[PDB]
Paper text:
Wallerian axonal degeneration is strictly reliant on the NADase activity of SARM1. It is therefore intriguing that the endogenous ortholog TIR-1 does not support WD in C. elegans, despite its demonstrated NADase activity and overall high sequence similarity to SARM1. We find that a series of interlinked molecular alterations in SARM kinetic properties, the order and strength of oligomerization, auto-inhibition, and regulation by nicotine nucleotides set the two orthologs functionally apart. In conclusion, our investigation into the absence of WD in C. elegans has revealed that while hSARM1 ectopic expression in C. elegans neurons leads to axon degeneration following nerve injury, the ceTIR-1 does not. Together with structural and enzymatic studies in vitro and in cell culture, we have determined that the stronger NADase activity of hSARM1, particularly its lower Km value, is the fundamental reason behind its ability to induce axon degeneration, whereas ceTIR-1, with weaker activity, fails to do so.
To determine the ceTIR-1 structure, a construct lacking the non-structural N- and C-terminal regions (162HMD … QQR872) was expressed and isolated. To determine the 3D structure of ceTIR-1, we first performed particle picking and unsupervised 2D classification and averaging. It revealed that, like hSARM1, ceTIR-1 is also assembled in a two-ring structure with an inner, scaffolding ring of SAM domains and a peripheral ring. However, unlike hSARM1, ceTIR-1 is mostly assembled into 9-mer and, to a lesser extent, 10-mer (class 8) rings. The peripheral ring clearly has a different conformation in ceTIR-1, where each ARM domain is separated from the neighboring ARMs and extends perpendicularly from the SAM domain’s inner ring. No symmetry constraints were applied, and a map with an overall 3.5-Å resolution was produced. Eight of the nine TIR domains are packed in two slightly curved rows of four, with antiparallel 2-fold symmetry along the long and short axes. The ninth TIR domain is docked on one ARM domain that is positioned completely different than the other eight ARMs. In stark contrast to that, the ceTIR-1 TIR array is readily assembled, without the need for NMN to release the TIR domains from ARM inhibition and without NAD+ involvement in stabilizing the TIR active array. In conclusion, at least in vitro, the portion of ceTIR-1 particles that do form ring oligomers are assembled in an active conformation with the TIR array pre-formed even without NAD+ and mostly free from ARM inhibition.
Numbering used by the authors:
A (entry chain G), B (entry chain F): 194 to 695, 707 to 849
The structure:
């Protein structure tokens, strides 16, 4: 499998993770409504998504795992557990069903560990035992039960205390008409046997489980038979229980069942149930290959490891068999006289092949020059690798590259070759993880905004940009400092800040008939001293009378009221606030403007002050400037003092 | 056939598909009225279009198929089915007829599969059996019947349960006068026999069908005879049924009927009926070439395969005979002592010739360097191919090319060579599918806007443009980022975003005798300022006063009122809205015009403002301009400011 494919996988993973995180959040909004149909629909969407994820060509396992992690990280998993185990869920069993199905999809090793750490284990087990009303409930029950049985020996042994084995027996005995029940039963038995001590195995066997595994291995369903063969061969792998399985006759079915199948053919049937098979479950199956075990057990183990090798080739994770050392046991079995086992082991070793030179870390800033060399080589620029080495290019340096650097320091002459190269580098830039350095999850943010914007991450990050600062950038800063020359991309992120939401110094109020002199004079005089001073002289707009007359007051810090003879007279009995000086002054009072009356020399307050409306009457008590034409400069200085405080 | 022709075909296909999709939509808008003449006319147009499509020089089959797909995709096909089978259609059987004729054109393999998937099959069958009232009904009936008989064995067998065979017999027996009836009968018999199991074949034969096929093969019509010869030779190809045909002279007619024709002459005759001939129908005919079958059956099969080879040469799909392996059976027959069959088989093999090196995928971004090399070669740039290879050019890179890249990295020195090359590349760009990457069918949108604009698709798509954003682009973004340097093309898409929304600009209201000279001057001054400004004097014609006065206001955005010594006067107590200035101003308010009073130099509002009707009273509290004759230019500047903000 190529480095182009390593990149494509990483890229796809990051991309679809970002996408499915968002879609999962939407589905979790329907869950978080806490309404039956919405929880059902949300869980249905999550279920569909998780299955589609598992059906994704090769990143399926990683993408499933990452979403299982995200479910824990978001507490979505915790919420599902609570909204499954809660007795209130009896209001609609279909809510419990959909929650349970999702939990089934999400029962990763780390999710089961979470369940154990939070001690939900027995609650979930009992609630699975309560899921019994229909074959669907029974299948889901046996599934969740069997999934709990993928945790360590102590947990399985603790769960034996529930006597769920008898519940399992009764479940398949009730509804053998469903092959999927027989599958989930045989699965549960395989899992518990694989994940239990000698004592617990003995307790399981006492429930006539070898004879029930004979029953299961006698069914028409190859997946049930596969699990039944694994389960009995797990028992057979223990010396003292071989006679009990011999008495069950199941070993006599085992090898013929394997003989009439091929692991890779069975893989295509088994895929739906192969999804979620894991390293520690392989580590526990590995002992069944050993020459100490029965030919039957060795044959099952060999067939199984070939099947897994097939799947792990597709996943590009054949390394697991080297990590657990299974390759040695396969060689032993391939050399053994157990022809069936030896064939399957030889076939498994045929699938094993050879290692990758490097698995590249998605944290590409951490790349050594050796990594860059390998990448460059594999993307088909071999003749330049020596020059990259000579230039001592590293992960960080790659991310900074421009065509000039190629043109000059790499000496890479073809513009076309540069285009080609840069396309790969852009792909890589998008694909790369930055969480190594991105404290702010700016990468995640950009991906969410649009995936390609990932390309800019490292530049802006290294310029010291972070997720909080994005609000504050000009198109210039973006374009130049962050190098986002594409205006389309700039527009996209601009839309984020367009959607992230949701001055006058002095207003002059005056009498239009008489304050006209003093007010505009004040306007002009204040325009000397650098104040923005505004007044309804020469300015009105937008048709129906301009509400600017109050908006301009709201924007103003200071409110000057010109008081000329009889200026206040029309405010008398203006209780309906019809007078515009009233509207202006009321607005000033409501918005706590720094209000200054300026008294013309001839001004006098109205005799009937009590007739001034209550909301504005306070103006008769206010702090103001008696305007004296003789002392205009001093009067204006006083006005400025009231403005400056 | 050249790659230039592959491109021309692909181009034409994409082009005419876009066109005929739009035309089909128009016809479907007539159908969607659910009114007899509109359904009839729409279906008539679709029928004409489908026949014209079938008459299209090369791409006929693909274009027909793509439109059959589009019909399903648009649910147009579903609508036709419903509007055919519905009992309400008995209101006008001509509706059912036109729907049925269109369905006949549109009964591709996938369309028949749709019918089967939706279980409409028996409903359509029975309704076809009800189409019996005229020779036209009978022909269409036998057609739809025969078309249903081109689905797989189980469907044909299920339709035998209707005893439609007796209906078929009675139909042609009723109307022997019509060659087209005899054709659709012989077709239905050929199809059902070709698409049925042994048991169903036996049931068909029991309806005296060999003797009816004698009758049909005895008729003067060569197309009826062809189908009759195929039908009997289908029966003759089955061991137990040779005597059931041999009871009749039909095999004795068969070879002489072939002998007096040439497959290519018959192709030109049969064309009308040669349309729609599937691979699957060929796959079922292939066994009739085998040396196990009669000389008659081998002769029919050989003649037929020559005829089909003739048509598939024209359609550029000779590959079918390699895919189904018919070439081997033709070689066997060509080697056989069946001289007539051997001649036709030799002629068929003469037509077969040799394969194309590549059939290019219209998804040209997916092209390998090998594909580009092949393209470059075939467009007549062979001497550069090695340089393209050396430059490692791919599908994506081709789409990015500029003359600079040719000039430098290809070292294509002739500007003329570049022009020539770019012309082909533009053609290819237009022709190419992008749906591989275009989530939004922006390609389709651009094509619909104008086909050549396809040229820009890949650039803007790779810049991250999508169908939603197009509204929002500046001429700069278009020109520069999207590279649409042709302003004409920019204008075209500008028209699209103009018409993504949705003349007198300013109306002048006045009291006639006092707005007068000023009102007129306002028109003149605003016309000097470029506004199309009109007045009460101008816009009264050939009818009632209101009915010409007011319409100007709705089309205007801006509404000036000249306020004057009798402006508002006649509005007082005008509760019945009798005053024309009232009607004008009310209309302005109702349609939210940005209304601006212009106060004459000696203007006063009515002090008895409370007598102004409530719907227009707001005008006394409006943003206006005091006209002062001495400052006419400043006043008009102010008017412009109120208009523009």
């Amino acid at each position: 499998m190529s480095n182009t494919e390593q990149v494509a996988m990483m890229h796809t993973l990051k991309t679809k993770l970002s996408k499915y995180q968002a879609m999962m959040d939407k589905a979790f909004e329907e869950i978080a409504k806490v309404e039956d149909a919405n929880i059902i629909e949300g869980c249905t969407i999550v279920r569909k998504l998780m299955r589609k994820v598992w059906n994704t060509p090769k990143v399926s396992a990683d993408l499933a795992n990452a979403l299982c992690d995200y479910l824990r990280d978001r507490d979505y998993f915790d919420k599902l557990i609570k909204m499954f185990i809660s007795p209130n869920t009896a209001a609609c069993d279909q809510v419990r069903m959909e929650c349970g199905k999702v939990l089934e999809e999400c029962t990763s090793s780390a999710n089961l560990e979470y369940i154990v750490n939070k001690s939900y284990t027995k609650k979930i087990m009992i609630v699975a035992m309560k899921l019994n009303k229909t074959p669907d409930q029974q299948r889901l029950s046996l599934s969740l039960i069997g999934n709990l049985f993928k945790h360590s020996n102590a947990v399985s042994l603790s769960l034996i205390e529930t006597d769920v084995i008898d519940h399992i027996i009764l479940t398949f005995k009730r509804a053998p008409e469903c092959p999927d029940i027989l599958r989930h039963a045989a699965l549960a038995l395989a899992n518990i046997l694989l994940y239990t001590c000698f004592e617990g195995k003995k307790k399981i066997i006492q429930k006539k489980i070898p004879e029930w595994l004979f029953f299961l291995a006698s069914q028409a369903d190859d997946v049930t038979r596969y699990y039944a063969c694994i389960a009995v061969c797990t028992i057979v792998s223990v010396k003292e229980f071989e006679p009990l399985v011999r008495k069950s006759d199941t070993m006599k079915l085992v090898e013929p069942f394997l003989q009439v199948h091929d692991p890779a053919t069975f893989a295509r049937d088994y895929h739906k149930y192969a999804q979620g098979n894991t390293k520690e479950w392989l580590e526990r199956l590995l002992p069944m290959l050993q020459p100490s075990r029965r030919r039957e057990a060795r044959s099952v183990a060999a067939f199984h490891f070939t099947l897994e090798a097939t799947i792990k080739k597709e996943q590009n994770k054949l390394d697991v068999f080297q990590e657990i050392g299974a390759i040695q046991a396969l060689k032993e079995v391939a050399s053994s006289p157990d022809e069936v086992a030896a064939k399957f082991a030889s076939e498994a070793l045929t699938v094993i092949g050879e290692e990758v030179p490097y698995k590249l870390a998605q944290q590409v800033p951490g790349w050594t020059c050796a990594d860059v060399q390998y990448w460059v080589k594999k993307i088909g620029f071999e003749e330049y690798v020596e020059k990259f080495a000579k230039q001592m290019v590293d992960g960080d340096l790659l991310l900074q590259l421009t065509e000039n650097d190629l043109k000059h320091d790499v000496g890479m002459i073809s513009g076309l070759h540069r285009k080609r190269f840069l396309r790969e580098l852009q792909t890589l830039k998008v694909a790369a993880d930055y969480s190594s350095v991105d404290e702010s999850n700016l990468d995640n943010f950009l991906m969410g905004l649009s995936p390609e914007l990932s390309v800019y991450t490292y530049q802006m990050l290294t310029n010291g940009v972070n997720r909080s600062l994005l609000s504050s950038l000009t198109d210039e800063m973006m374009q130049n400092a962050c190098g986002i020359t594409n205006p389309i991309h700039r527009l996209k992120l601009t839309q984020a800040f367009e959607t992230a939401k949701h001055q006058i110094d002095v207003f002059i109020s005056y009498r239009r008939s008489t304050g006209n002199q003093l007010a505009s004079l004040i306007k002009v005089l204040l325009q000397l001293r650098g104040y923005r001073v505004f007044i309804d002289v020469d300015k009105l707009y937008a048709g129906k009378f301009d509400s600017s007359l109050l908006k301009n007051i709201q924007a103003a810090k200071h409110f000057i009221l010109v008081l000329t003879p009889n200026s206040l007279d029309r405010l008398l009995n203006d209780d309906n606030c019809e007078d515009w000086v009233h509207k202006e002054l009321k607005c000033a009072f409501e918005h706590q403007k720094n209000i200054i009356p300026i008294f013309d020399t001839a001004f006098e307050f109205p005799t009937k002050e009590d007739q001034i409306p209550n909301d504005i009457r306070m103006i008769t008590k206010y702090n103001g400037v008696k305007w004296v034409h003789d002392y205009q400069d001093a009067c204006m200085a006083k006005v400025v003092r009231f403005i400056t405080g």
